[PDB]
Amino acid sequence: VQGLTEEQRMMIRELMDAQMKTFDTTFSHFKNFRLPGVLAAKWSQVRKDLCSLKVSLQLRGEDGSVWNYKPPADSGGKEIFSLLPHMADMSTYMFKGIISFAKVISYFRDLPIEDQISLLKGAAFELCQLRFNTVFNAETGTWECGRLSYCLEDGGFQQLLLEPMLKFHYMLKKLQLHEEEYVLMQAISLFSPDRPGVLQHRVVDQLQEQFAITLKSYIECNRPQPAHRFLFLKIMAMLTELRSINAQHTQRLLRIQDIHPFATPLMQELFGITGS
Numbered sequence: 001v002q003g004l005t006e007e008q009r010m011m012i013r014e015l016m017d018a019q020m021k022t023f024d025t026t027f028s029h030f031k032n033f034r035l036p037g038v039l040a041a042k043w044s045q046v047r048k049d050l051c052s053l054k055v056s057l058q059l060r061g062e063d064g065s066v067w068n069y070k071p072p073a074d075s076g077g078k079e080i081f082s083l084l085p086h087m088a089d090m091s092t093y094m095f096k097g098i099i100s101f102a103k104v105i106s107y108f109r110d111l112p113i114e115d116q117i118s119l120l121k122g123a124a125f126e127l128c129q130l131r132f133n134t135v136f137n138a139e140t141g142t143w144e145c146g147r148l149s150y151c152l153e154d155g156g157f158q159q160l161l162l163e164p165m166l167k168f169h170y171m172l173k174k175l176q177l178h179e180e181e182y183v184l185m186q187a188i189s190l191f192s193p194d195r196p197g198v199l200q201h202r203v204v205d206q207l208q209e210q211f212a213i214t215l216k217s218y219i220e221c222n223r224p225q226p227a228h229r230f231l232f233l234k235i236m237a238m239l240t241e242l243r244s245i246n247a248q249h250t251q252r253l254l255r256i257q258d259i260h261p262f263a264t265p266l267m268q269e270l271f272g273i274t275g276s
């Protein structure tokens with residue numbers, strides 16, 4: 001790129017190579033996953049919690065066959081849980097890729113093991129959502145995950161933007177970010193010094209500032225257009241919003257888990273569930 005220091009260029013290269021090595025953008029190795037079956041104030045809140053993300057599922061076979069799943073309506077029973085095993089398997093697959101991402105980055109490997117764990121626990125969900133945005137089709141409201149597709153169900157478009165996670169995906173897609181800007185967002189999220197349990201606050205804070213400076217300079221050197229004025233500040237605002245979404249989603253997941261267990265072992269580990 002233009003105008004960056006040698007170190008800033010090395011930093012982007014390290015992140016881009018980690019992304020390349022650990023982001024299966026065709027989802028070719030996502031296999032053996034579960035699928036929905038064929039054919040008291042807690043519950044009220046868990047009902048509201050589950051209806052926030054309503055998707056149909058399409059699976060396109062290599063042979064040309066297509067399976068399509070349309071979810072039920074909420075009618076007061078366990079049917080609101082039908083996609084949870086599947087989504088648990090997808091989130092587990094994505095978390096593994098995010099853990100692999102972080103472990104390949106020198107700046108992360110050099111942290112104490114305890115801070116490595118605290119940073120992954122704090123950011124795993126946010127990095128997953130950033131990766132999912134790169135496969136989000138805003139015109140069709142669909143996450144295109146190779147041969148799998150997750151399509152938002154039909155109030156219209158303005159009413160979907162009321163769900164913070166969906167507004168986030170649509171707003172982030174509109175910024176038309178480069179791969180390099182997505183991976184710097186992932187690094188700024190990963191190297192957050194204020195996650196619970198971080199000990200090397202000062203080292204992590206210094207690393208995060210360098211990633212943010214690199215992103216700011218990347219944008220200044222490579223995006224002169226009036227449309228990209230304030231882009232760096234827009235991205236940082238989205239990262240702050242993404243952290244809020246993370247906290248809301250973690251509370252939602254724990255409420256659902258409390259009355260209807262579904263988290264895989266890796267999810268339990270990331271969410272602090274002990275098994276007792």
Ligand SMILES: CC(C)Oc1cc(-n2nc(C(C)(C)C)oc2=O)c(Cl)cc1Cl
Pocket residue numbers: 055084087088090091092094125128129132143150253267
């Ligand atoms: C299983 C559920 C309660 O919790 C999660 C779901 C997801 N999501 N979200 C999606 C989109 C938004 C449909 C692409 O796909 C996922 O697997 C992630 Cl990343 C992490 C967790 Cl913990």
